Design a protein around this ligand. Sequence first.
Ligand SMILES: CC[C@H](C)CN(C[C@@H](O)[C@H](Cc1ccccc1)NC(=O)O[C@H]1CO[C@H]2OCC[C@H]21)S(=O)(=O)c1ccc([C@@H](O)CO)cc1
Lengths: 99, 99
Amino acid sequence: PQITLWKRPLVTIKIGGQLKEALLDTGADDTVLEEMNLPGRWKPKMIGGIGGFIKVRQYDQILIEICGHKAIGTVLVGPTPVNVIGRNLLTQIGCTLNF
Amino acid sequence: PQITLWKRPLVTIKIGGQLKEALLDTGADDTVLEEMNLPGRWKPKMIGGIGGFIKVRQYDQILIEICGHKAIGTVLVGPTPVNVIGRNLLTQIGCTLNF
Ligand SMILES: CC[C@H](C)CN(C[C@@H](O)[C@H](Cc1ccccc1)NC(=O)O[C@H]1CO[C@H]2OCC[C@H]21)S(=O)(=O)c1ccc([C@@H](O)CO)cc1
């Protein structure tokens, strides 16, 4: 699809078999989701944003579908203010900026 | 043009008579710029992201040129680690997400 930006680019994602809403975020290197239960092993990591750093659980090689497009990559889980889909997965679904 | 997301979508902008590098950021409602001494009146604001909130100064009707495309609107100025062009100006230069 072509998504205009007069509204937040929110889309439905599927991860761990559960549906969620997330924000397509070209300013995010990484994908960061709010607290949730995910199967498999994880490692603790730190990520920084505009307001400082937070602790997250890093899940590697996770299946995640974004608006019907499949991706498999790293998902960070922690106290983010909103679910954000970052460039690590946007590249996988073939997302570009155009003007 | 078309910008892929393999790397950060950094572009050159012109604001306040200065050239700067900024991210085309679909995850930001408004534009947020690193500390700079803009003239004119402003309004305090708080914006929240990963890590928490920062205090910024809101300037209205500020002219910005983004890759040769003129825009005018709200710019938030504060101790952000990066300049981000948000949706308030991305819409004005005709920027869409595509996949
Ligand atoms: C809550 C939704 C997102 C988080 C909101 N942010 C935009 C988002 O693109 C930031 C931009 C950014 C910030 C600092 C360094 C680098 C990039 N990226 C980000 O945090 O990414 C994380 C994960 O990947 C890593 O790579 C880069 C950092 C890591 S914001 O800046 O905090 C923001 C909040 C409110 C407003 C107001 O206008 C109302 O929207 C505008 C902007």
